[PDB]
Subunit: 264 residues, 4 copies
């Protein structure tokens, strides 16, 4: 900790970093999938969508899956991959290998693309034992519900599930990792600002999605996540309360896979 | 605007930049002082505190003062002045010139230092026609009220005034330019996020004060203010609502000098 | 018109609590109507008379030869406003199911929600259409744990889940009472920020207590006749008051999600 | 204790509206006491009986030989709970000032606020201490325009402005009623976010109407006996309910700002 303009004001940066919030949310999504799979083993798993939770989710499936393949429409996202054991395939390469080849016949398909993502037509080409589709919808919004087609994507699999992620007692427009991280920080700032002696509270946010998809720079994106989530200007010490508010907001994240019953 | 991850999601950056919010706030504070002065002319004006509103306030005072001197405890803040007509003096040079010299005898003294700023003892050494002290307090906070000594600073001047700045119907901990800018952006984000089709809203904020006082880099600080105040991810267009919400939150800023 | 003195105005909203209740129950009834696609039924059974059940049963009289409301509380027969709707307490329905053939509905609607109808009772029917109201609103761990909506969708050739939310706003349940309270509370927050408003009063009380503890439907209906909000202000706010309330009422979105 | 069924709990707060009112009036009375520094007075005049005036006038009985409450509404004599407090309506005070020497207070306290006593009436006194309650809370252009607190501080050797705010929270005025309503409304917002809560009811009504329109102080006092909040939830929330209310009551800060010269 340091001082601000003069020694009468303190500047406190949270120990909790943006990457720590991202890690907690992705781990909750990976654990939801793990719980839903009930320790079942698979020959080949295909995970659509590398950013932002896909990387850690694919890595978490290596223990029970002989082969894990991440599929992404953006080839540069091979850089966001967690481990060498995860195979990366461009959408162009997958489509080609499906038409002319027998190497692709997964028993576990996980769709994490969400809004404007994979089409139900591509999903229908598979015949897995388990199909998991991530529902990008958070709390109610007409515009988001209209563009969402999660139900149409659950067209294959003996066992089907929908990965849902919300914040308990708080409003979020989507279940997206980025949306949730931003909402956790924003909600923490509003409460932090009400602590006695606080002058102002800064959420250290920027359009991180732009660094990944517009600048096509995964390395820079990961560096940007290394910043303290919040910076506070105050007369008195707030370091304790600052981590407790952030932690409380991170703990509200609840992720689970809802099983979709289809008897045939 | 542009698209986000796919063409199904739009990315919109506000036309309103952080510098535009800063400019609106500083102009409101400068206008409050102008309205309070009622067109009175002065031989020498001394303004304590260059950052953040002081620079524009001193510039605006050249219309009514023969000489305008910005005084700051940080010598590198001479870089935040944008007009050569504004004279700069660090606190030590001023204190020395007061003891051994007659060149300093202002008829207009403006204290914008706020929390942990200029002591009432230094203010008591002047005998101006008008004294304006900026109250750093915003809405009620016990910790901030305890450290504040604005009333003790109003110890000289034939006419005395307290520059106050608040947000109508909204809570702000201080009247500081930076505090107001941050609160305007944060409150705008809260309302923008509730617009139909919005996925998430990003306030493009950072600890700008750090760039000025810790990195001692005014140039970099000014470059950082060129960023769009808010970035929005949405399914539908939100261009108008984005600017209208930020505009509405900037309009809530009310600055005025209360005469004592 | 005035408050303590003639310098302050007292404004009571033209929108009454009953008007908010009516709008919500009509949205739920319309969601069911849209989902039914004009299909006609010989016998409809609706579980849960309070609070939307009464109007929902009334709206089924056109396309249903017989509409029966079932409630665990016999005094809730008083909340029905049309003699064409038959009433049966839960014990009477259970008796008639064991010893009788008069009950064999082609349309079953469960509106009991939390701690309501058991899936075991629902499993005794074989209708053409089954509609179960999901009491869950936005995410809450405690509410999700007690909810068993999915287990209740165990019969019917066509199955649907009635869902009700507030667009861009948080609500713990889809319950009529919850939504009405939330609409009023959110309206108060925005009304209080209007210029010149001193304070805003939501005219609320534990209405559920009048119905289930005092067992007085008549008194409950009389209590809903109150203006939703009372405002104390310096200037006129009548227009803004009705606009803020209407806007919050319009966020209610009700629909039946078909379960394939 | 249960709601519609035994699966849902109904909890009424132990804290009653009267308890919130009492805490706010006591904070205002204590602010005045601190400011007076134990000074004794021959005659104190307090303008405005509702809502904090009654308890403030009561707290002045110890250090003042005579305490007179002045209210434009004669029925507000019913809100006084001690016979030691003399009551005079505005008309009687105005008559006694013109034709009489019985009124010459050394302590004048104006609690009328918005549309209250005129500076012209205040200027007719020459007390040792003058305290004017500032009705303004946080910033609002409309309230600021109608407010004339500064013009009311025209007499007294020692002058003070009674200010009351909520730390870190927005309130349009310093009025007892406004603060009570805001404490309850803010508590409801936080209570509703507790896990398992279905909905939260603030037990509010236009209490001011009972006092000034129905002219019924007795009924108004009875209406304050109600629990401040009623909660519907799946799990127990009794302790959190009380903690959030107490926390919001504790944010009230009242103090008299001394006006020099
Ligand atoms: N048709 C398609 N096939 C494969 N990947 C796709 C796709 N459309 C989009 N994607 C990828 O899927 C991701 C969409 S972003 C989804 C966010 C994610 N559910 C989370 O919560 O973190 C991006 O990596 C994008 O490049
Ligand atoms: N004793 C002193 N003399 C002169 N300048 C001082 C000072 N103490 C602090 N300052 C300066 O005054 C400023 C304090 S920041 C005040 C913020 C300003 N009122 C606003 O709203 O924009 C800084 O520029 C700091 O360097
Ligand atoms: N097992 C059961 N059988 C029939 N009715 C029941 C029941 N359990 C509860 N009820 C009734 O169903 C209602 C539950 S309250 C449900 C609120 C309603 N969905 C709304 O939004 O308005 C009450 O009328 C209650 O008495
Ligand atoms: N000119 C006047 N003289 C005396 N009393 C007046 C007055 N105008 C209004 N009043 C009274 O003063 C009170 C105004 S309400 C003020 C609220 C009070 N400050 C609080 O916080 O509780 C009412 O009792 C009203 O009848
Ligand atoms: C959830 C989601 C999505 O499915 C698609 C997209 O482009 N953005 C988001 C928001 C996010 O990534 O948080
Ligand atoms: C108002 C203020 C101040 O007087 C002193 C300081 O160090 N910080 C602030 C906050 C700000 O600049 O907004
Ligand atoms: C939704 C709901 C419910 O299913 C059961 C109960 O007891 N209360 C509510 C809340 C309400 O009526 O709004
Ligand atoms: C403060 C105040 C006032 O001075 C005059 C009035 O009519 N209403 C209020 C509001 C209140 O009593 O809370």
């Amino acid at each position: 900790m340091n001082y601000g303009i003069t020694e009468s004001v303190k500047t406190t940066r949270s120990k909790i970093k943006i990457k720590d919030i991202v890690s907690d949310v992705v781990e909750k999504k990976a654990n939801a999938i793990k719980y839903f799979l009930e320790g079942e083993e698979f020959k080949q798993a295909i995970v659509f969508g590398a950013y932002l939770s896909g990387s850690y989710i694919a890595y978490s499936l290596l223990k029970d899956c002989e082969e894990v393949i991440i599929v992404d429409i953006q080839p540069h996202l091979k850089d966001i991959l967690f481990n060498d054991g995860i195979k990366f395939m461009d959408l162009n390469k997958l489509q080609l290998e499906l038409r002319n080849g027998t190497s692709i016949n997964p028993d576990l398909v996980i769709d994490l693309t969400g809004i404007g993502g994979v089409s139900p037509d591509l999903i229908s080409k598979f015949n897995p034992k388990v199909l998991i589709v991530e529902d990008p919808k958070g709390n109610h919004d007409k515009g988001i519900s209209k563009i969402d087609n999660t139900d149409k994507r659950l067209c294959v699999g003996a066992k089907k599930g929908v990965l849902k992620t919300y914040r308990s007692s708080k409003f979020s427009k989507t279940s997206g990792t980025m949306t949730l991280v931003v909402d956790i920080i924003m909600d923490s700032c509003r409460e932090i600002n009400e602590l006695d002696s606080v002058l102002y509270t800064i959420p250290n946010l920027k359009y991180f999605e732009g660094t990944v998809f517009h600048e096509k720079n995964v390395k820079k994106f990961l560096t940007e996540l290394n910043m303290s989530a919040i910076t506070v200007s105050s007369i008195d010490h707030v370091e304790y309360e600052l981590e407790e508010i952030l932690s409380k907001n991170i703990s509200r994240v609840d992720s689970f896979v809802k099983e979709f019953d289809k008897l045939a």
